[PDB]
A paper describes a structure:
Initiation of macroautophagy/autophagy is mediated by the ULK1 (unc-51 like autophagy activating kinase 1) protein kinase complex and the autophagy-specific class III phosphatidylinositol 3-kinase complex I (PtdIns3K-C1). Two hydrophobic pockets, HP1 and HP2, in the Ubl domain of Atg8 ensure binding of the side chains of the φ and η residues of the core LIR.
ATG14 is the autophagy specific component of PtdIns3K-C1 and is responsible for targeting the complex to sites of autophagy initiation. The peptide walk for ATG14 revealed two potential LIR motifs: A minimal motif of 7 residues with the sequence GDFVYFD (LIR-F64 denoted ‘LIR’, core amino acids F64-F67) and a 7-amino acid sequence of TDWENLP (LIR-W435 denoted LIR, core amino acids W435-L438). We obtained high-resolution crystal structures of the LIR peptide complexes for PIK3C3 and BECN1 with GABARAP and for ATG14 with GABARAPL1, respectively. Co-crystals of GABARAPL1 with WT LIR peptides diffracted to 1.14 Å for BECN1, and 1.4 Å for ATG14. They all display 3 conserved hydrogen bonds in-between the main chain of the residues in position +1 and +3 of the LIR motif and GABARAPL1 residues K48 and L50. The ATG14 LIR-W435 (WENL) on the other hand, is a W-type LIR motif with a clear preference for D or E in position −1 and displayed almost complete flexibility for substitutions at the +2 position. The ATG14 peptide array confirmed that the two salt bridges formed by D434 (ATG14) and E436 (ATG14) are both critical for LIR binding. The ATG14 LIR had the strongest interaction with Kds of 2.85 μM and 1.9 μM for binding to GABARAP and GABARAPL1, respectively, followed by BECN1 (Kds of 10.5 μM and 7.95 μM) with PIK3C3 as the weakest binder with Kds of 49.5 μM and 65 μM. The higher affinity observed for the ATG14 LIR motif compared to BECN1 and PIK3C3 is most likely due to the presence of a tryptophan in position 0.
Author numbering:
A (entry chain A): 2 to 117
B (entry chain C): 1434 to 1443
The structure:
């Protein structure tokens, strides 16, 4: 359901992920988009090059700042429809959840359950 | 297009 996948077929996405992993080998590519039904602002950009040793919390902080929420606006992130463990790094999430186009897909929402 | 995220520092 991500817009990046509605916009580009698999082979295009794979060739982009492959090319990015070869050009920036110490980064992992991550597509960040709103979850279905989410009532949250859009990000300016959806394609991120993430340092593999970022912790999940550090990633949350960086993405949250780009959404420009008020502090009182809650924010949740999902990988494969589940909130990731906080104790992970983004390289771990990528190792365990990247798709066959070489991208990790992260959804975000105001709600704590994906697709609510 | 892409956004390169920073790393934290000691």
């Amino acid at each position: 359901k991500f817009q990046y996948k509605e916009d580009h077929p698999f082979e295009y996405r794979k060739k982009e992920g492959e090319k990015i992993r070869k050009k920036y080998p110490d980064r992992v590519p991550v597509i960040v988009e709103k979850a279905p039904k989410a009532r949250v602002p859009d990000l300016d950009k959806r394609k991120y090059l993430v340092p593999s040793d970022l912790t999940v919390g550090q990633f949350y902080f960086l993405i949250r700042k780009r959404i420009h929420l008020r502090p009182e606006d809650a924010l949740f992130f999902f990988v494969n429809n589940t909130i990731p463990p906080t104790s992970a790094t983004m390289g771990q999430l990528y190792e365990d959840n990247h798709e066959e186009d070489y991208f990790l897909y992260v959804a975000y929402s105001d709600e704590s359950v994906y697709g609510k | 297009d892409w956004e390169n995220l920073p790393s934290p520092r000691f």
